[PDB]
Amino acid sequence: DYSVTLQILALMTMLGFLPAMVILMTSFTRIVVVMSILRQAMGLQQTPSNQVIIGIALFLTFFVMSPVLNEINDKAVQPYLNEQVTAREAFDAAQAPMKAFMLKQTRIKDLETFVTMSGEQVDNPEDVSMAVLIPAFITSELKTAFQIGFMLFLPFLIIDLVVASVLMAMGMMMLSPMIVSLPFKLMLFVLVDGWNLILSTLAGSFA
């Protein structure tokens, strides 16, 4: 096994890659994109602000991915602290719960595309390497976030078309419909309890 001095250096180095792990392995990516798309849907540009958008995503990605953290703790963290497992085995024991979560939250077509691009022969979907699963996961999650986000865009686009046509009906061709539609865009989101509706579906969307 690696010496004590080296294995302290190993965990210290990857302790700084924690933001990297969050963005491209857990549910942080999908929620932020959906939040960003919905922010552009209303007339407000940066009213929710970036920090609040991230703060909600960080809380959501912890509640939703809580089963993943539970399995990693009891299968990798606990055996290592009891000297029941070595450094490499503990690290591998943590990859399996996270690789399983990423594998089930991707699209077959994307994985089929990536295994062809990676040039590796794998007979079954559940045996793909993590090197090719990570790009396949984020590519599929981007498609899911765009498809979910733009469907939320549609009701706010409906309001814009209705008000713009009404203003053009009376010959008021110079009045900008966007400033008139803005109060009604906000009302639609608050009447449907939007801030609870999107998060409930986003939480339930994962598995």
Partner 1 sequence: EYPTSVVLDWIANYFWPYVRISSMLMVMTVTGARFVSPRIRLYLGLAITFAVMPAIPAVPQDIELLSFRGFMTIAEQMIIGIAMGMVTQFMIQTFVLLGQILGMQSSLLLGQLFMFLTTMFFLATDGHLKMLQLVVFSFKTLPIGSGSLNAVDFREMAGWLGIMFQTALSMSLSGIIALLTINLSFGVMTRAAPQLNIFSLGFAFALMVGLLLCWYILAGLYSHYEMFWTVGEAQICRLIRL
Partner 2 sequence: ASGAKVGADFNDLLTKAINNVNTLQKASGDLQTRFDRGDADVSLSDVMIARNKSSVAFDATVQIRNKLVEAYKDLMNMPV
Partner 3 sequence: FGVSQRLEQERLKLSRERQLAQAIEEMKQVRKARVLLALPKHSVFVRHNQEASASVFLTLSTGTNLKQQEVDSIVDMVASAVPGMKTSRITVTDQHGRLLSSG
Which one of partner 1, partner 2, partner 3, none interacts with residue 5, CB within 5 to 8 A by kind?
A: partner 2
Restricting to residues 164-203, name those near partner 1 by CB under 8 A. 164-165, 168-175, 177, 179-180, 182-183, 186-187, 189-190, 193-196, 199, 203
For partner 3, which residue of 108, 166, 168, 172 counts as binding (CB under 8 A)? 108
Q: Which is nearer to partner 3, 110 or 141 (CB)?
A: 110
Angle of helix 130-169 relative to helix 194-205, nearest 10 degrees, comes to 150
For partner 2, which residue of 36, 86, 105, 113 counts as binding (CB under 8 A)? 36
Q: Which is nearer to partner 3, 74 or 112 (CB)?
A: 112
For residues 42 and 157, is the Cβ–Cβ distance under 8 A? no
Restricting to residues 19-38, name those near partner 1 by CB under 8 A. 20, 23-24, 29, 32-33, 35-37
Q: Which is nearer to partner 3, 8 or 108 (CB)?
A: 108
Residues making contact with partner 2 (CB under 8 A)? 2-3, 5-6, 9, 12-13, 15-16, 18-19, 22-23, 28, 32, 35-36, 39, 50-51, 53-55, 58, 62-63, 66-67, 69-71, 73, 77
